[PDB]
Amino acid sequence: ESVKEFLAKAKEDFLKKWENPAQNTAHLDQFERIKTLGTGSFGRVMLVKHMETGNHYAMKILDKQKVVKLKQIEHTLNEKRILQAVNFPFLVKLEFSFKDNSNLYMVMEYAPGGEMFSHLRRIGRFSEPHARFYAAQIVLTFEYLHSLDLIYRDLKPENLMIDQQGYIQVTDFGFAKRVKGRTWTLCGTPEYLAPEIILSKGYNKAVDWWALGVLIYEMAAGYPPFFADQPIQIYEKIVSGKVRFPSHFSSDLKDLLRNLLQVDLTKRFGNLKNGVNDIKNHKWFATTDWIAIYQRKVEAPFIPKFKGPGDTSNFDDYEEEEIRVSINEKCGKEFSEF
Amino acid sequence: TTYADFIASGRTGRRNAIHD
Missing domain, CATH: 1.10.510.10 (Transferase(Phosphotransferase) domain 1)
Incomplete structure (x- = not known):
C-alpha cells in the first residue's frame, strides 16, 4: 500500500x-516570556516570543526537582526523545529543547486556537x-x-x-x-x-x-x-x-x-x-x-x-509565577541526556 | 439528565493525570 x-x-x-537525539538547541534568554497558557504538576506552558525570528512558540517548563519527586524522570526523557524524533501533520513540532540548572524546556509550535x-x-x-x-x-x-x-x-x-x-x-x-x-x-x-x-x-x-x-x-x-x-x-x-x-x-x-x-x-x-x-x-x-x-x-x-499572532484569547487566564533558576545544577545525572 | 449530573459533578474542569 x-x-x-x-x-x-x-x-x-x-x-x-x-x-x-538533538540537544541544547537554544537558551532561555533567546525568548521573551509573555503569558502562561496552561499549568500542570511538573510545570506550566507559556506563550513565548523568539526574539531573533519574531516567532511565537509555546514553551513547556518542567522543574527538575518536581519531576524527580513524582518519579517521572524516565517519562520526561521519553517525551523529549520521542517528540524530537517524530513528524506528522497533527503532532506538535518541537523546535528547540534545552535545560538549565533548575528546569527542562521544550519549545513547541504555538496553536492559537486553544x-x-x-x-x-x-x-x-x-x-x-x-x-x-x-x-x-x-x-x-x-x-x-x-x-x-x-x-x-x-x-x-x-x-x-x-x-x-x-x-x-x-x-x-x-x-x-x-x-x-x-x-x-x-x-x-x-x-x-x-x-x-x-x-x-x-x-x-x-x-x-x-x-x-x-x-x-x-x-x-x-x-x-x-x-x-x-x-x-x-x-x-x-x-x-x-x-x-x-x-x-x-x-x-x-x-x-x-x-x-x-x-x-x-x-x-x-x-x-x-x-x-x-x-x-x-x-x-x-x-x-x-x-x-x-x-x-x-x-x-x-x-x-484569532485577531493576530500571539493572541491568547482562546486560553483561560492563569496566575503567573517568576521562573527561578538556581545557581546550583539540580539533577544533572538524572537528566543528562535531555 | 446525564448532562445535568455531569455539570453538577466535581470533574467538569481540566482533569489531571495520575502518575503513580
Missing part, C-alpha cells in the same frame, strides 16, 4: 533521530460531523505512532489544541513510550483509562484505541462515558463493562463506540488482525476521505477566531 510505504519511510526517518477542552465545554457538545473530523485525525496519528512502536497514553480534550486552520495538534507526550510488547505503568487520566491498566494486567497499544472511544463519546455527548466525583468510583464504572449512549447518537456511532469501548482486548477495534483498518472502514467514517484529512484540505467545521 501507499500508506504502508509512507509508514516504512517514516519509520526510517524516526529511527535515525531516535538513535541520535484547547479542544475549552470549546467543547462551552459549546457543550460537537455534532457527529464535527466530532468525526477530529476523530479521523486521531486515527491517523495513532496509526503513525503505533507503527513506530510508540504508545501515547494521555488522549483527552485537554491535550488536543486547535490550530489556525482548525485542525488538531496533539501535545503532551509526557506518557508516550516506545515499547514492543507490554508495559505496566499505571498512568493516564482516570476517565480515559482502559480496564487493562486499572486491573494491573499488563497492556499495550490497545489502550490508545480505548481512549479514542472515550474521546469520541465525550465530544459527541459533551460528557465522558464514565464519570463520578472521585476516581475509584470512575474505575468501577470502567471495569464493569457498561456504557449508556445518549439518545441523539447515531447507531453507527454507537456501534463504533461499542467496539472501541470493548473490555475484551481480543475483541477491541484497533487490536485485531486488521488493526487500524477496522476503524477506518467502519460505517461511521464512510464519509471520511483519509488522504484529504492527512493533506489538510478538508474544510474544518470550526475555525477559532
Whole structure:
C-alpha cells in the first residue's frame, strides 16, 4: 500500500533521530516570556516570543526537582526523545529543547486556537460531523505512532489544541513510550483509562484505541462515558463493562463506540488482525476521505477566531509565577541526556 | 439528565493525570 510505504519511510526517518537525539538547541534568554497558557504538576506552558525570528512558540517548563519527586524522570526523557524524533501533520513540532540548572524546556509550535477542552465545554457538545473530523485525525496519528512502536497514553480534550486552520495538534507526550510488547505503568487520566491498566494486567497499544472511544463519546455527548466525583468510583464504572449512549447518537456511532469501548482486548477495534483498518472502514467514517484529512484540505467545521499572532484569547487566564533558576545544577545525572 | 449530573459533578474542569 501507499500508506504502508509512507509508514516504512517514516519509520526510517524516526529511527535515525531516535538513535541520535538533538540537544541544547537554544537558551532561555533567546525568548521573551509573555503569558502562561496552561499549568500542570511538573510545570506550566507559556506563550513565548523568539526574539531573533519574531516567532511565537509555546514553551513547556518542567522543574527538575518536581519531576524527580513524582518519579517521572524516565517519562520526561521519553517525551523529549520521542517528540524530537517524530513528524506528522497533527503532532506538535518541537523546535528547540534545552535545560538549565533548575528546569527542562521544550519549545513547541504555538496553536492559537486553544484547547479542544475549552470549546467543547462551552459549546457543550460537537455534532457527529464535527466530532468525526477530529476523530479521523486521531486515527491517523495513532496509526503513525503505533507503527513506530510508540504508545501515547494521555488522549483527552485537554491535550488536543486547535490550530489556525482548525485542525488538531496533539501535545503532551509526557506518557508516550516506545515499547514492543507490554508495559505496566499505571498512568493516564482516570476517565480515559482502559480496564487493562486499572486491573494491573499488563497492556499495550490497545489502550490508545480505548481512549479514542472515550474521546469520541465525550465530544459527541459533551460528557465522558464514565464519570463520578472521585476516581475509584470512575474505575468501577470502567471495569464493569457498561456504557449508556445518549439518545441523539447515531447507531453507527454507537456501534463504533461499542467496539472501541470493548473490555475484551481480543475483541477491541484497533487490536485485531486488521488493526487500524477496522476503524477506518467502519460505517461511521464512510464519509471520511483519509488522504484529504492527512493533506489538510478538508474544510474544518470550526475555525477559532484569532485577531493576530500571539493572541491568547482562546486560553483561560492563569496566575503567573517568576521562573527561578538556581545557581546550583539540580539533577544533572538524572537528566543528562535531555 | 446525564448532562445535568455531569455539570453538577466535581470533574467538569481540566482533569489531571495520575502518575503513580
